[PDB]
Amino acid sequence: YRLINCNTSAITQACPKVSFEPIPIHYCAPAGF
Amino acid sequence: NPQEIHLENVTEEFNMWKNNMVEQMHTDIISLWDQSLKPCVKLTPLCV
Amino acid sequence: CRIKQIINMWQRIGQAMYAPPIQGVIRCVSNITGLILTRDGGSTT
Amino acid sequence: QSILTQPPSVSAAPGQKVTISCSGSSSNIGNNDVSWYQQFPGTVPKLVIYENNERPSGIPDRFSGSKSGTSATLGITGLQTGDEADYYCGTWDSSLSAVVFGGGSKVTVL
Amino acid sequence: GIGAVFLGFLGAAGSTMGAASMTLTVQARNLLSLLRAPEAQQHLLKLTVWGIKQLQARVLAVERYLRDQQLLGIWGCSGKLICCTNVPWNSSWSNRNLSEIWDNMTWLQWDKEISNYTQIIYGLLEESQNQQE
Amino acid sequence: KKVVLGKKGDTVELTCTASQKKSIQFHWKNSNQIKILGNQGSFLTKGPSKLNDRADSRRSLWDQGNFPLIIKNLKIEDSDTYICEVEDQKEEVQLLV
Amino acid sequence: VQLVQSGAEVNKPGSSVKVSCQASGATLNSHAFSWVRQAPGQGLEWMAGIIPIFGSSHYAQKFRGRVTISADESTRTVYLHLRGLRSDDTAVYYCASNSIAGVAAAGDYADYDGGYYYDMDVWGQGTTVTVS
Ligand SMILES: *[C@@H]1O[C@H](CO)[C@@H](O[C@@H]2O[C@H](CO)[C@@H](O[C@@H]3O[C@H](CO[C@H]4O[C@H](CO)[C@@H](O)[C@H](O[C@H]5O[C@H](CO)[C@@H](O)[C@H](O)[C@@H]5O)[C@@H]4O)[C@@H](O)[C@H](O[C@H]4O[C@H](CO)[C@@H](O)[C@H](O)[C@@H]4O[C@H]4O[C@H](CO)[C@@H](O)[C@H](O)[C@@H]4O)[C@@H]3O)[C@H](O)[C@H]2NC(C)=O)[C@H](O)[C@H]1NC(C)=O
């Protein structure tokens, strides 16, 4: 209730070595805004 | 062809530290990296 | 600089361990357009 | 070839306490952890004690461990008849840069 | 298409309400205002979610416009820009001189003025258009 | 105006707590308004106080609102007042050894 | 999680043997693999072991040169090639592994040459290799 058990889980996906180049993403507003 | 209008004579109070689209940029970058940099081992605390 | 493999995620609270670094050369050409400082109010400089 | 000086067999009547020693240098036990593994003859071995005092799910709590100085003791309080196997202690030897085992400890029911 | 004119209304903000209604007459005429590459089978279902997503906007810009002029058409006038009706102006709706409204106020001021009363006028515009029919 | 007593060396767990369960940003300052310990998003940070090497916190509890402060090696000179600033609730806890 | 090995092998001395060890998981990078053997009736010993999250391998000092370990991530199979077959290699082999995730709680910079083989429990079914 104070030192409550926190199960630190561990999920393991399938991890390749992928590229990462951030492109500009600009936020538009919907119709009527 | 983007539409942009300059508005004459208007004054307008902004605020930077209470914008509600900064928490909409924060959501779509959590959603980017989780589908972008898939890790080998996570350790996410569950805390039941 | 280093290249760590066991990082803390900025996304949520948790750690992440990744693959070893890639074999070739790794270039980075970035243009610093901003800082983030923080003071420390004593009782001055 | 046994770097760890495990005794080759321990023996007690069913329903008692046994001890199994795993004595090593100050580069395999005095700095590192110990573990214990159980193997029935013919079948694949099985981990029984990890992180020097804990048991996995599916292990009775009669198996206890301790790490004292440069040696380690495994204790089975209340020996049953279904423990007819042999035990091995396995640590990491830092100086030899390899996992190091013991000679084996075949418990026997009386 | 139509979403271009939905934002062109804002060109008259900051001016006075007598001038902005006159600019709206000019704006009335100003509110009268292609993926053909070799597409692989990987590009086929990806350039089509780029097609539907733009076409969920062009129909929303139509469906918002018809949800406007369904609400106007309840209040007597459908398709009129400047439309005055047969309800008398009540005095308790932030009483002010008519020269003190069309000459020294911008339109955004009226949002701050009568938004406590804007729902009450809308029911009156329904009833008097229902009482007259 | 809480009261916390220690002996020497031991770990005290001062605690501020919000009602949100969503890891909101806090801090921890002292009577001279120097930063003791802070949260920056999902990472921890210290401040240039004299508890900069000794202070700590429990990382897994931030996701449930609880933002403690765990101090090791209690000297006599840290007997002060400490302030947790979650968003407005500037609660003061004082400490003695 | 379970591990399947390759089939049993008979051989003459001087040749080189191959034993596979396929994992049922999603990747090999979460597990620190290990190869142990058992001559019939005798004790256990540690031959070699690979950790693919650091790319590091480890060899016992009695087995350097004769033993190499390769792991294929695309097929999730740990391979063992043993060169220099002699008489005493008539034994059963075992591929074992433990969770590598226990070093996330280490002091920032870990050790990328060090040894993180401890207390495995994912022993495969085994492979008997007999020399003649
Ligand atoms: C701020 O913004 C800037 C953008 O302006 C960012 O700068 C970018 O940084 C990234 C990260 O390094 C760069 O990506 C990498 O660039 C490497 C250098 O490539 C350039 O030089 C070589 C040699 O002259 C050319 O061949 C390249 O041409 C390539 O790019 C053009 C487009 O410009 C393409 O159209 C071509 O087809 C070419 O592919 C560039 O001119 C490059 O080596 C690297 O590619 C490898 O790395 C990734 C993983 O990192 C792999 O997925 C990829 O397949 C390649 O991997 C091979 O090579 C490595 C050796 O490095 C081996 O180890 C692999 O096993 C494999 O064999 C990638 O392209 C990016 O170019 C750069 N943008 C520029 C310069 O405009 C900053 O990062 C950003 N700041 C921050 C903080 O993000």
Side-chain angles (χ1 to χ4, degrees), chain A residues 1-12 14-16 19-20 22-33, chain B residues 1-7 9-17 19-37 39-48, chain C residues 1-39 41-45, chain D, chain E residues 1-21 23-33 35 37-38 40 43-99 101-128 130-131, chain F residues 3-97, chain G residues 1-107 109-110 112 114-132:
Chain A
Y1 186 71
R2 294 297 105 172
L3 280 78
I4 320 167
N5 207 57
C6 281
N7 297 331
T8 64
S9 63
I11 170 175
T12 74
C15 47
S19 42
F20 210 68
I23 66 167
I25 297 155
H26 47 265
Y27 290 90
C28 304
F33 286 72
Chain B
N1 324 300
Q3 170 171 38
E4 173 174 339
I5 301 178
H6 202 295
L7 314 183
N9 275 317
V10 57
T11 192
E12 171 61 44
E13 176 173 70
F14 277 67
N15 195 7
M16 165 173 44
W17 311 101
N19 206 340
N20 57 273
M21 56 202 291
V22 154
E23 300 273 347
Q24 263 200 73
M25 186 166 185
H26 194 44
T27 281
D28 288 275
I29 296 171
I30 301 305
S31 157
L32 199 153
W33 278 49
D34 276 327
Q35 320 173 16
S36 200
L37 292 174
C40 300
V41 169
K42 276 181 200 169
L43 280 89
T44 59
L46 187 54
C47 284
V48 74
Chain C
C1 309
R2 317 292 307 189
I3 296 191
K4 271 175 68 80
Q5 309 209 22
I6 313 163
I7 46 181
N8 304 263
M9 320 168 77
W10 56 273
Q11 323 186 6
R12 51 200 67 87
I13 293 183
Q15 293 154 331
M17 305 206 317
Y18 271 91
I22 205 55
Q23 267 162 346
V25 78
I26 296 162
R27 282 180 154 202
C28 207
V29 280
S30 50
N31 289 355
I32 298 169
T33 77
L35 296 168
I36 289 164
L37 314 183
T38 302
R39 280 173 317 129
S43 300
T44 49
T45 60
Chain D
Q1 72 178 17
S2 194
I3 303 97
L4 276 302
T5 81
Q6 281 209 240
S9 301
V10 309
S11 314
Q16 294 166 344
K17 275 204 62 44
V18 305
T19 184
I20 294 179
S21 278
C22 175
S23 280
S25 160
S26 278
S27 159
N28 58 314
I29 296 195
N31 312 335
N32 308 325
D33 56 3
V34 298
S35 158
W36 306 84
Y37 313 96
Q38 184 199 28
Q39 181 210 17
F40 297 99
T43 75
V44 288
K46 184 193 177 181
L47 163 68
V48 64
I49 291 295
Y50 78 106
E51 188 43 285
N52 321 289
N53 51 11
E54 302 168 28
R55 313 156 299 115
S57 306
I59 295 303
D61 67 299
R62 53 174 159 273
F63 307 96
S64 88
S66 158
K67 214 196 75 165
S68 315
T70 188
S71 82
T73 81
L74 156 71
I76 318 172
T77 301
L79 183 132
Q80 293 176 349
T81 70
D83 305 345
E84 296 185 350
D86 71 333
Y87 291 112
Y88 295 88
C89 69
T91 79
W92 166 269
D93 198 291
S94 69
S95 43
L96 275 300
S97 89
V99 192
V100 66
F101 278 114
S105 292
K106 322 172 61 68
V107 77
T108 42
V109 286
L110 320 174
Chain E
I2 296 297
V5 314
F6 263 107
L7 197 150
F9 294 155
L10 304 188
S15 52
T16 79
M17 321 164 49
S21 292
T23 293
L24 172 56
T25 76
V26 170
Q27 201 263 326
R29 191 58 72 154
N30 281 185
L31 73 93
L32 263 290
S33 164
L35 279 155
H43 290 46
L44 187 76
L45 296 200
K46 291 294 197 40
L47 292 188
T48 308
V49 82
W50 278 5
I52 303 170
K53 272 204 170 70
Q54 303 176 293
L55 213 58
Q56 269 172 24
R58 279 178 42 168
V59 194
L60 186 61
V62 169
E63 281 193 346
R64 190 156 307 272
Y65 175 75
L66 297 201
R67 199 165 45 237
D68 286 339
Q69 313 222 336
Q70 205 174 47
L71 188 55
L72 284 182
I74 278 298
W75 309 335
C77 42
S78 68
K80 301 291 183 291
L81 293 201
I82 302 166
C83 163
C84 83
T85 183
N86 317 285
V87 181
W89 203 72
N90 190 284
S91 295
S92 44
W93 294 335
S94 281
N95 226 30
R96 207 166 287 198
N97 204 341
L98 193 145
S99 190
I101 278 167
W102 301 88
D103 310 323
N104 50 76
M105 276 167 86
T106 66
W107 262 111
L108 293 94
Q109 299 289 322
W110 270 80
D111 178 83
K112 307 305 162 185
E113 277 301 314
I114 63 142
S115 39
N116 302 12
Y117 305 137
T118 38
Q119 289 301 313
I120 310 186
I121 320 167
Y122 291 169
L124 262 67
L125 291 186
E126 284 188 333
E127 273 186 353
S128 157
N130 260 318
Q131 189 264 326
Chain F
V3 175
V4 154
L5 250 298
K7 258 305 182 185
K8 187 144 298 183
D10 262 275
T11 57
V12 300
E13 190 200 291
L14 320 173
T15 294
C16 49
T17 300
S19 49
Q20 281 294 344
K21 313 184 209 307
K22 63 173 42 44
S23 160
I24 54 179
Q25 153 160 347
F26 65 97
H27 281 284
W28 274 97
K29 297 163 65 91
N30 61 341
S31 72
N32 221 0
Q33 307 296 283
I34 321 177
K35 286 191 293 299
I36 288 299
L37 182 136
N39 181 24
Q40 283 291 327
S42 213
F43 314 104
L44 184 74
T45 178
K46 305 308 179 48
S49 63
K50 279 99 118 203
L51 259 72
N52 89 345
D53 77 336
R54 285 175 280 276
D56 219 291
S57 158
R58 202 166 308 254
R59 193 169 311 245
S60 105
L61 297 175
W62 297 347
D63 219 281
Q64 313 278 1
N66 314 32
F67 309 132
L69 159 68
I70 300 179
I71 304 175
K72 304 180 273 224
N73 196 335
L74 283 163
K75 287 180 241 302
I76 20 209
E77 295 88 355
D78 343 331
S79 319
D80 231 47
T81 228
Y82 295 128
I83 283 135
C84 174
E85 309 170 350
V86 191
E87 53 267 3
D88 57 320
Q89 298 114 317
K90 302 178 55 187
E91 313 153 34
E92 307 147 32
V93 189
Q94 64 98 53
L95 177 131
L96 265 133
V97 300
Chain G
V1 56
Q2 50 95 6
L3 310 190
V4 64
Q5 273 104 329
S6 59
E9 195 51 50
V10 301
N11 221 355
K12 277 300 185 182
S15 51
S16 279
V17 71
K18 182 254 291 181
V19 291
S20 198
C21 176
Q22 191 161 19
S24 51
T27 180
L28 311 164
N29 296 273
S30 44
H31 282 137
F33 287 98
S34 166
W35 283 101
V36 286
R37 71 181 189 175
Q38 189 178 38
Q42 313 173 14
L44 282 170
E45 68 269 61
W46 188 75
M47 282 189 48
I50 194 179
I51 301 170
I53 197 72
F54 310 129
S56 68
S57 62
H58 279 273
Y59 297 117
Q61 78 284 347
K62 323 175 304 182
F63 281 81
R64 326 208 68 250
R66 312 188 42 228
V67 190
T68 193
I69 314 293
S70 72
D72 207 285
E73 194 64 40
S74 44
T75 77
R76 308 194 313 277
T77 44
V78 182
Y79 285 128
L80 159 58
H81 307 294
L82 171 57
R83 312 189 315 274
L85 257 183
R86 40 165 294 177
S87 69
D88 45 357
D89 310 341
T90 315
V92 62
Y93 290 118
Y94 291 107
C95 59
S97 88
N98 48 334
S99 88
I100 200 56
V103 287
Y109 301 92
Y112 288 93
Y116 307 111
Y117 314 94
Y118 38 83
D119 56 34
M120 55 291 283
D121 63 8
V122 184
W123 319 79
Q125 85 263 6
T127 315
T128 79
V129 168
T130 45
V131 79
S132 160

